[PDB]
RNA sequence: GCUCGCCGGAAGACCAAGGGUUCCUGUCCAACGUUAAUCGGGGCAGGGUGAGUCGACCCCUAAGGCGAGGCCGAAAGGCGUAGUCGAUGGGAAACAGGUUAAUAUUCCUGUACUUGGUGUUACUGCGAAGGGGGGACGGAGAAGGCUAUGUUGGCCGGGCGACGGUUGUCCCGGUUUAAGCGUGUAGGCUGGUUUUCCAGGCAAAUCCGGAAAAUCAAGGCUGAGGCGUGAUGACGAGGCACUACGGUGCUGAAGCAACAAAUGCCCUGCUUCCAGGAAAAGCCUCUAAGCAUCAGGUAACAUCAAAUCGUACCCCAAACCGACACAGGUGGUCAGGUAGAGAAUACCAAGGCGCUUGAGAGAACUCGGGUGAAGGAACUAGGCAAAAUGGUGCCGUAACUUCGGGAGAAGGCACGCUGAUAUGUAGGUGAGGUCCCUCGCGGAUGGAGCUGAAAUCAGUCGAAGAUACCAGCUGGCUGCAACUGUUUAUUAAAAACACAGCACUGUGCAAACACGAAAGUGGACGUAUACGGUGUGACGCCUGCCCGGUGCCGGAAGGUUAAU
RNA sequence: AGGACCGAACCGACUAAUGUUGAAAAAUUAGCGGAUGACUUGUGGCUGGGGGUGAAAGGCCAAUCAAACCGGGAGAUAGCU
C-alpha cells in the first residue's frame, strides 16, 4: 500500500532545509532552538 | 602558468593496485592519488614538471570514503581523487 | 445555424451546436496572441475566492482593440475568427498602412468589408465614433464609459445598446440590462450590434461540456452539513430557512448595490 | 534490539481505531454494543 | 555436472526517483539469516566508479517563489514593479568493435563530429537590456511510403545419427556490420523574381507588414528510407597450438535474396473537429546611438581549449516506501517464436529462477480443488456460493421507443483432417527481359519467383472438430434515479452527490461576491447572450389556490426613536 | 463521430471465501466496474487549523480529524475512581 513517506531530496531540502529555515523569522527561531538544545544536525541537509 | 608552490601540493601518492599495474604495463597510464581540489590542468602540469615526462591526457575520478567502524563507533573515511595520467610514447616513470 | 445532434449515445442526445462556416479554420494571427494562464478561482493568497472554476481547455489571449484609436484610416476586414475568451467572434482587420488588429465582430460584418474609426466616419455597422456624432435611437455596441478608456458596455454576443437621448454633455443609453445610464458624449462607440446572437441557442448536452469550459460542479447548499452552508442538515431534505448565500446574506431578493459614487449616472435601475 | 523493542512497544499508544480493540485486535464488539442498546 | 519444474508484456534487460558501497576479490562463522551453513546484501581487509559528445552544472523560461525602490500594515510583517531564481519544458556535438573479477557511447582500436579563443590570408559596412521572422507546440481519424524485426529460400560449415527408417522434397548452426560523409527519393508545404511608393512594427530600417506595376512559369523549403562510402577493416560458425583445465593465443568459410511487417520513422505532416490548443533564449535577419582607411563581420587554413561534479551496485526490489531478507506500493524504456484479432491466453527462446526449515505418515477437522447415482432451489433472509453460457460466419429476431435503439434480443445451422477445383485459387508483392526517353532512386509492358485467404464438391477419423487455455447465462413484471460519472482512504457505491436543462434573484464594472486590519488579488485582461448566489434536476404532459405569519422589495404621510 | 460498444495495460473496488496473536495496522484468490475521457499518471508548485479543500461523506489535511501535529499556559480542573 502506498505509505505516507514518498521521499524526494529536492522537496526535503526546499521544504525543511537550511536555506528555507533561514528564509524567515520563525525558521531562524527553529535553528536557534536546535542550536541551543545543542544538536548534532540542525536541519536536514545531507 | 601554474605557480610551482601550487603545483607541488597536487600530486600525493602513486596508486598501487592491479588495475594501476595493468594500466602502466599495458596502456602507458600511471595512476596516482591527487589533491582533492586538483584540476586536470594542474595534474598534467605537475607530472610534466615534477616527473619530467610528457603527458598526453589526464582522466580524474573521485573515490568516496568507506564507512568503517571500530568496535561500535562508525566513521566514514575520506574522499580522495585518483588521476589516470596517460603519458606519450616516450616515458619511464 | 444551430444544429441538433442526432441522438447516438446519450450525451449527444440533447446537444445543439452553433456552427459557423465563415469562421477561420486555422491558426490565429500570432503577434496579437499572448499567454493567458488559468487561475482556478484563486487569488494571490492561494484561496478559492470565486468558486466553481477550474480545469477546462488551454486558451491563448487575443489582444482585441477595444479602444479603436486609429482614426480616419480605413480598414478592410481580413477574416473572422473564433475567440475563446469571449462569447462573440473577433474580426481580424487590416488597416491601409499595414497594421492588423482584432476587433469585436459586429452583426453583419463579413470578410472584405470597410470599417473606419474616427469623428468623420460614415454611419454604417462597424465604425467606431464618438456618441455626440451618432444619431439618437441607434443600436451601438462596445460603448466606452469614460472617454479614451476602451469599450466596456455591450461586448458579449448578440448585445447592443440603444442611444435614447443627447441632453448636453451626456447621452442617455438603454443598456442591455434595461437600465438607463448617462455616459459622457465624448465616449466612442461602435455602430451596429455585436454578432454571434445564436450563441444563446446552444445547449451543451452533457456534463463534460461544462467541464471543458472550466466550470467545476456546484454542490447545492441543502446537501451539506450545517457546518458547511447555512442550509445544512436535517434528516431527509429539510429546508426550513430563508435562502441565503454561503456566507449568510439573503439570496432571492436582497439588493446588494452600494456605490453612491456612480448613482449620479443612473437614470433608472433595471426591471 | 532494546531501542527497537521500546519503540515497538510504543506503536499503539496514540491510536484512533474503534472497531479494533486497542487499535489492532479484531473483535465483534460493534455487534455486542449495538445489540445491547 | 546431468536431469526435472517455474516466469518469459516477466519472476528477462536498461534506467529515473530513492538508497548509499549493498559492487568485486580474499578471508571468518560469534551475532544477523525464522533451520544447518563451508554460504550471504553478515564480520574484517584490500580493490573498484576514467567523458569536449551521456547526465548535471550552463544559456532560456512555465506554474510559482523571492523581491531594490514602492504601496500597505500596532511591531513582527503582507503585496508587488524593475529584476532575480525556478524544469517536469526549449538550447552544440560519437558511433561500431574489443577489454576488467569488478567501469565504460568514459579505457583501447578504427572512423567521426561540435562549439569557442588566438594567429595568418582574401573580401568586407559592423554595431543593441530595440524591430521582424523563427523557436511555437490541441483532440481524433485516415491511409500511403518505410524501417526495426521476423519467416522462408540460396550460400557456407558441420552431421548421416543408442530403436524401424534417414544421400535427401533430410538434420543442426551461421548468414552481422554503426555513427559520420556523398547523393537526393516516396511524400508535405509554398507561386517565384525585379522595380517603385507608404498614415504601420514607440525612433530608424535595405528586415517585416502593406499598395501598385512588369515578367517568368518555375524556383525554393522540408523530408523517412534506399543506394554509395565508412568497410580490401571489424565481427563471424567453427578448427589449430599450448593448456596453472579456469581457459589462453593463432586462424577463420558464407556473410545473399524474396516475402511479411509495427504501437517506431516520414509526421511538429494530412484530413477533420470544437473544447480553439505554453513562454523565453539559442538561431536567422533589420537597423539606432556610435565606429567608419581602426574596430568588427564573412570565408579558408593552422593552432589551442572544452573546466567542474555524477558515473560502482539494487532499481516492480532481500538494496527504495511498508518496524522484517514483509504474498503490499513504486514512473519511464526494449519487447523474439508458434497458435491468436491481440501487449489476452497456452507453450517456448534470450535470460532468470525453484520462493533460507526439512524428513515422514496419509486420522478427525479446516483451507484450495476434481467427480458424483436419482432428484433439481426442495437450501436459504435471499439461487449466497457453485454449475451453466461463452468464438467466427450466415440465417433470424418481439413489445416498447426520444426512431438512435431494444439487439449479441430471443433461437438456430456450419466448423477438424485430406484431396480436387487450383502439381495452392482470388488477392498482395513483383525480378530478368522488352519500349521510350525531359536518362534515372524514371515511367509503360511483362509476368518468373515469393506470399496467400475464403468458398464449394468429394472423402476420412473420433463419443466429441469454437475440442486445451481463453471466452455473454437468457427471458418476463416492477420501485428509484434520466444517462457517463462522484462519494464515506480502512464495515455504507446507493435511490445519496454531480449533471445537462429549467427558474428565481443579485450584479452597469472601481460589478455583485470572496480572500485580505490594509495594500492588493480572484471574479476577468470578462461586461448583462456576462458573472455570482439559490433551488429543481434529461425529455414529455404540466406546475392549481393562499400575501394572515416569517422574510424580501417598495413607499413616504403620521406615531415612537440615538449621538448632538 | 461518440462523457459510443466488447476487452488487456492502466484506474478502481461490487460479491464471496480465506486472513482476522494476518504474508498485510485493509490484503490474497476467484469472479467484478470504467477503460478517448467529467480519464489516468510522473515531476514541480499553491491553499493551514475554526483555517484549507470538499461532484458533500463531517470526507480528507502524513496509519491522527464534529476542529491536525508539536511545544507552552500546565502540576488546568476533577464535589469522581
Amino acid at each position: 500500500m502506498k505509505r505516507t513517506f514518498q521521499p524526494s531530496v529536492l522537496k526535503r531540502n526546499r521544504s525543511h532545509g537550511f536555506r528555507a529555515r533561514m528564509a524567515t523569522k520563525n525558521g531562524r527561531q527553529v535553528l536557534a532552538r536546535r542550536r541551543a538544545k545543542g544538536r548534532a544536525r540542525l536541519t536536514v541537509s545531507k | 602558468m601554474i605557480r610551482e608552490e601550487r603545483l607541488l601540493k597536487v600530486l600525493r601518492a602513486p596508486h598501487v593496485s592491479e588495475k594501476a599495474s595493468t594500466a602502466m604495463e599495458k596502456s602507458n597510464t600511471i595512476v596516482l592519488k591527487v589533491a582533492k581540489d586538483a584540476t586536470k590542468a594542474e595534474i598534467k602540469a605537475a607530472v610534466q614538471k615534477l616527473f619530467e615526462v610528457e603527458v598526453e591526457v589526464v582522466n580524474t575520478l573521485v573515490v568516496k570514503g568507506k564507512v568503517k567502524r571500530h568496535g561500535q563507533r562508525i566513521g566514514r573515511r575520506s574522499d580522495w581523487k585518483k588521476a589516470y595520467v596517460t603519458l606519450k610514447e616516450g616515458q619511464n616513470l | 445555424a444551430v444544429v441538433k445532434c442526432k441522438p447516438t449515445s446519450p450525451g449527444r442526445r440533447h446537444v445543439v451546436k452553433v456552427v459557423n462556416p465563415e469562421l477561420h479554420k486555422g491558426k490565429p494571427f500570432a503577434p496579437l496572441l499572448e499567454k493567458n494562464s488559468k487561475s482556478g478561482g484563486r487569488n494571490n493568497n492561494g484561496r478559492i475566492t470565486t468558486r466553481h472554476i477550474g480545469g477546462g481547455h488551454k486558451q491563448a489571449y487575443r489582444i482585441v482593440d477595444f479602444k479603436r484609436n486609429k482614426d480616419g484610416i480605413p480598414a478592410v476586414v481580413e477574416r473572422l475568427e473564433y475567440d475563446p475568451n469571449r462569447s462573440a467572434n473577433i474580426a481580424l482587420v487590416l488597416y491601409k498602412d499595414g497594421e492588423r488588429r482584432y476587433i469585436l465582430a459586429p452583426k453583419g460584418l463579413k470578410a472584405g468589408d470597410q470599417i473606419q474609426s474616427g469623428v468623420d466616419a460614415a454611419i454604417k455597422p462597424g465604425n467606431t465614433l464618438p456618441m455626440r456624432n451618432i444619431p439618437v435611437g441607434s443600436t451601438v455596441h462596445n460603448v466606452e464609459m469614460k472617454p479614451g478608456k476602451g469599450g466596456q458596455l455591450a461586448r458579449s454576443a448578440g448585445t447592443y445598446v440603444q442611444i435614447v437621448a443627447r441632453d448636453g454633455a451626456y447621452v442617455t443609453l438603454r443598456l442591455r440590462s434595461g437600465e438607463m445610464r448617462k455616459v459622457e458624449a465624448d465616449c466612442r462607440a461602435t455602430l451596429g450590434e455585436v454578432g454571434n446572437a445564436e450563441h444563446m441557442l446552444r445547449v451543451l448536452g452533457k456534463a463534460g461540456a461544462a467541464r471543458w469550459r472550466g466550470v467545476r460542479p456546484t454542490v447545492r447548499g441543502t446537501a451539506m452539513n450545517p457546518v458547511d452552508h447555512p442550509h445544512g442538515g436535517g434528516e431527509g431534505r429539510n429546508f426550513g430557512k430563508h435562502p441565503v448565500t454561503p456566507w449568510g446574506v439573503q439570496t432571492k431578493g436582497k439588493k446588494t448595490r452600494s456605490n453612491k459614487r456612480t448613482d449620479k449616472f443612473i437614470v433608472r435601475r433595471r426591471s | 534490539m532494546d531501542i527497537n523493542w521500546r519503540h515497538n512497544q510504543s506503536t499503539f499508544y496514540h491510536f484512533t481505531s474503534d472497531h479494533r480493540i486497542s487499535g489492532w485486535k479484531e473483535t465483534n464488539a460493534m455487534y455486542v454494543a449495538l445489540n445491547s442498546q
Side-chain angles (χ1 to χ4, degrees):
Chain A
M1 304 193 48
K2 183 201 198 184
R3 294 309 174 191
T4 58
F5 182 64
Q6 301 304 322
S8 176
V9 187
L10 177 67
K11 283 165 150 249
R12 176 74 200 256
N13 294 125
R14 283 186 187 174
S15 190
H16 302 301
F18 180 84
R19 300 289 322 296
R21 295 292 194 212
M22 287 291 295
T24 184
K25 172 73 175 174
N26 295 316
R28 287 197 296 271
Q29 295 168 10
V30 167
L31 294 179
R33 287 186 254 132
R34 299 285 298 219
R35 282 164 179 151
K37 188 159 171 181
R39 209 186 257 281
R41 64 199 65 79
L42 252 66
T43 63
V44 55
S45 284
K46 60 214 309 190
Chain B
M1 68 194 150
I2 290 95
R3 288 169 155 72
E4 195 145 307
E5 301 85 3
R6 184 70 184 86
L7 191 145
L8 287 162
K9 297 185 173 218
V10 164
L11 308 182
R12 291 181 65 251
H15 188 271
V16 285
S17 68
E18 59 279 3
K19 186 165 185 189
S21 174
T22 58
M24 290 173 65
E25 72 189 3
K26 197 156 62 73
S27 178
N28 293 317
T29 295
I30 180 164
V31 185
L32 40 85
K33 180 183 302 203
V34 298
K36 171 72 174 176
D37 55 357
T39 176
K40 288 176 189 176
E42 286 178 352
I43 296 160
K44 180 189 202 165
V47 177
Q48 288 296 110
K49 298 176 201 273
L50 264 45
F51 297 123
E52 64 216 340
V53 297
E54 294 165 16
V55 171
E56 192 161 17
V57 69
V58 185
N59 284 340
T60 63
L61 65 102
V62 173
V63 183
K64 268 78 173 193
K66 299 169 95 181
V67 167
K68 297 296 194 205
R69 69 189 199 277
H70 274 71
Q72 286 183 336
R73 192 86 193 161
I74 52 93
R76 190 181 173 84
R77 289 184 173 174
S78 176
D79 299 338
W80 52 279
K81 194 164 185 180
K82 177 180 188 167
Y84 286 97
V85 186
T86 305
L87 302 171
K88 293 186 182 300
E89 296 296 331
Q91 85 279 15
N92 295 316
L93 279 80
Chain C
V2 297
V3 177
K4 280 169 195 172
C5 296
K6 277 233 219 294
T8 59
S9 73
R12 291 292 278 182
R13 185 172 283 284
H14 291 293
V15 177
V16 170
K17 289 189 296 167
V18 175
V19 297
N20 200 0
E22 74 176 356
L23 297 181
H24 182 256
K25 292 180 166 152
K27 300 302 181 196
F29 185 64
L32 289 170
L33 283 166
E34 69 179 3
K35 189 174 74 69
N36 192 1
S37 181
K38 176 75 187 189
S39 64
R42 285 166 165 96
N43 68 351
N44 59 2
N45 292 323
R47 302 293 194 85
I48 283 167
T49 60
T50 299
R51 302 184 300 174
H52 304 158
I53 295 174
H57 203 277
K58 197 202 277 140
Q59 294 172 356
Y61 186 72
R62 292 158 175 81
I63 297 105
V64 171
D65 193 12
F66 299 103
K67 287 179 187 200
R68 300 287 296 281
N69 291 316
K70 288 180 78 65
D71 295 330
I73 302 161
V76 61
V77 171
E78 183 176 352
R79 58 185 187 263
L80 293 177
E81 294 197 351
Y82 187 81
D83 179 57
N85 305 301
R86 279 172 186 90
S87 305
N89 293 314
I90 54 178
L92 186 66
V93 305
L94 173 60
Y95 287 88
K96 303 281 176 181
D97 58 357
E99 186 179 355
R100 286 180 181 86
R101 281 189 173 172
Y102 281 122
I103 60 172
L104 255 57
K107 182 179 182 185
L109 175 137
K110 306 171 298 306
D113 196 356
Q114 290 291 112
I115 59 158
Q116 185 175 348
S117 176
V119 178
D120 52 356
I123 288 161
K124 72 164 274 167
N127 290 324
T128 292
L129 63 103
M131 282 183 292
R132 70 187 180 280
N133 300 314
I134 303 177
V136 163
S138 63
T139 57
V140 142
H141 71 272
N142 200 7
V143 185
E144 291 187 347
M145 291 163 66
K146 287 158 85 67
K149 182 181 189 177
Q152 312 176 319
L153 305 160
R155 280 190 185 181
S156 168
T159 295
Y160 57 95
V161 162
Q162 189 167 6
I163 298 179
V164 319
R166 285 174 61 193
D167 51 353
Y170 290 101
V171 283
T172 305
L173 267 46
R174 192 187 301 283
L175 292 177
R176 187 60 181 166
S177 181
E179 177 150 346
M180 306 275 280
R181 191 179 209 271
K182 277 182 190 157
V183 181
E184 298 170 22
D186 293 338
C187 292
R188 285 180 189 283
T190 304
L191 286 159
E193 63 210 359
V194 62
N196 192 359
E198 291 194 320
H199 166 80
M200 66 174 173
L201 274 76
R202 67 188 179 184
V203 306
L204 275 82
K206 63 182 209 204
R211 289 284 263 152
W212 60 58
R213 285 167 173 84
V215 185
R216 296 195 77 240
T218 309
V219 177
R220 65 214 194 286
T222 180
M224 306 180 188
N225 287 111
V227 66
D228 300 321
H229 203 278
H231 312 162
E235 204 57 40
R237 290 213 188 122
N238 251 295
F239 203 70
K241 304 160 182 298
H242 298 109
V244 296
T245 54
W247 297 279
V249 175
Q250 166 80 38
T251 308
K252 291 158 192 295
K254 168 145 213 329
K255 288 185 169 74
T256 62
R257 182 175 212 266
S258 179
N259 208 357
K260 290 194 204 47
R261 186 192 71 258
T262 59
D263 281 338
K264 189 182 191 210
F265 299 144
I266 306 308
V267 170
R268 192 162 59 257
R269 300 292 294 156
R270 76 170 184 282
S271 185
Chain D
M1 306 286 179
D2 295 331
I3 309 172
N4 298 320
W5 176 245
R6 289 176 187 155
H7 173 69
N8 291 308
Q9 279 185 345
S10 173
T11 172
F12 284 104
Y13 281 171
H14 299 92
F15 68 100
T16 50
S17 179
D18 56 354
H19 76 285
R20 284 178 184 175
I21 279 174
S22 305
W24 63 276
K25 176 63 184 161
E26 193 61 28
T27 179
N28 62 9
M30 180 175 85
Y31 295 101
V32 172
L34 179 173
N35 297 288
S36 296
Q37 306 185 350

